[PDB]
């Protein structure tokens, strides 16, 4: 439910396959992702125990030094939130509309690693819910997610998101009461 996670982004798919092989050889982890994404990057995701994933991440970072400037971002979370896993495993269902009075927060970042880190921090701090999470899928390389909750909770999580994301944040918007027509598409 709460394993460790490691994320790497590289400019080359060829170096991505080399990096993934080094990570898999170093420690007994499970490869969640190794594929090219927009706009011509490579995304690698692993999971397992915190010590094994840390060992694999160190080995993968060693190999990436072969490509001068080929590393875009990376992250490592020692214990992922339970709400993050269904969206990463790609097997998920649309959450119900438990409260029509909930506000929404829409966040978009440049990198996948920044999005996963900011979402995990926001979920751990404020009492909010994750409605949507899209990871660089035909949107020009950006990533975005949507959080739901009260107005005070959402503004608290906006503070956490702004701090974690840093200079990789593209935009952040809070909508106090979504319309009925919008609520159908957002809650998906």
């Amino acid at each position: 439910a709460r394993p460790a996670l490691g994320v790497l982004e590289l400019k080359s798919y060829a170096l991505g396959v080399a990096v993934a092989d080094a990570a898999l050889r170093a420690a007994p982890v499970e490869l969640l992702k190794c594929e090219p994404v927009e706009p011509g990057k490579a995304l690698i995701m692993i999971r397992g125990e915190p010590e094994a994933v840390a060992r694999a991440m160190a080995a993968a970072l060693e190999t990436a030094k072969a490509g001068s400037g080929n590393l875009i971002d990376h992250a490592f979370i020692g214990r992922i939130h339970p709400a993050l896993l269904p969206f990463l495993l790609e097997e998920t269902a649309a959450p119900p509309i438990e409260d029509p009075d909930e506000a929404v927060l829409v966040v978009e970042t440049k990198t996948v690693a920044a999005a996963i880190e900011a979402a995990d921090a926001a979920l751990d701090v404020a009492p909010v819910r994750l409605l949507r999470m899209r990871l660089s899928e035909h949107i020009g390389g950006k990533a975005y997610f949507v959080l739901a909750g009260d107005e005070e909770a959402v503004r608290k999580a906006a503070r956490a998101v702004r701090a974690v994301a840093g200079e990789k944040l593209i935009d952040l918007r809070i909508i106090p009461r979504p319309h009925e027509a919008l609520r159908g598409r957002l809650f998906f």
Partner: protein, 103 residues
């Protein structure tokens, strides 16, 4: 960042609790130190408490104004330490920013 102030040992916890419960700081650590300073050209020696205040980059101006508008002594100690944010835990920096209620 981290802000350092020095207060007499008696008013350490009252100030720290009132600083946190008012949302001006996410966290405070208290250290009993021993202070050597020059008063009227003579080296003195007193026991004080050192306060390490964990606040966000946006709550610093409110914290400084709140401190010297209430600090007992004539020249309050208020030093802000630069924190290297790229090598620090980013999820704790988010915790610091969220628990510093702007109000």
């Amino acid at each position: 960042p981290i802000a350092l102030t020095v207060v007499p040992p008696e008013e350490a916890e009252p100030l720290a609790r009132e600083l946190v419960e008012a949302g001006l700081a996410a966290e405070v650590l208290l250290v009993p130190v021993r202070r050597i300073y020059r008063e009227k050209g003579k080296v003195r020696e007193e026991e004080v408490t050192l306060l390490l205040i964990l606040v966000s980059r946006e709550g610093v101006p409110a914290l400084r104004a709140w401190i010297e508008a209430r600090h007992p002594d004539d020249i309050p100690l208020f030093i802000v330490l630069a924190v290297d944010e790229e090598a620090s835990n980013k999820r704790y920096l988010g915790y610091i920013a969220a628990e510093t209620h702007l109000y």
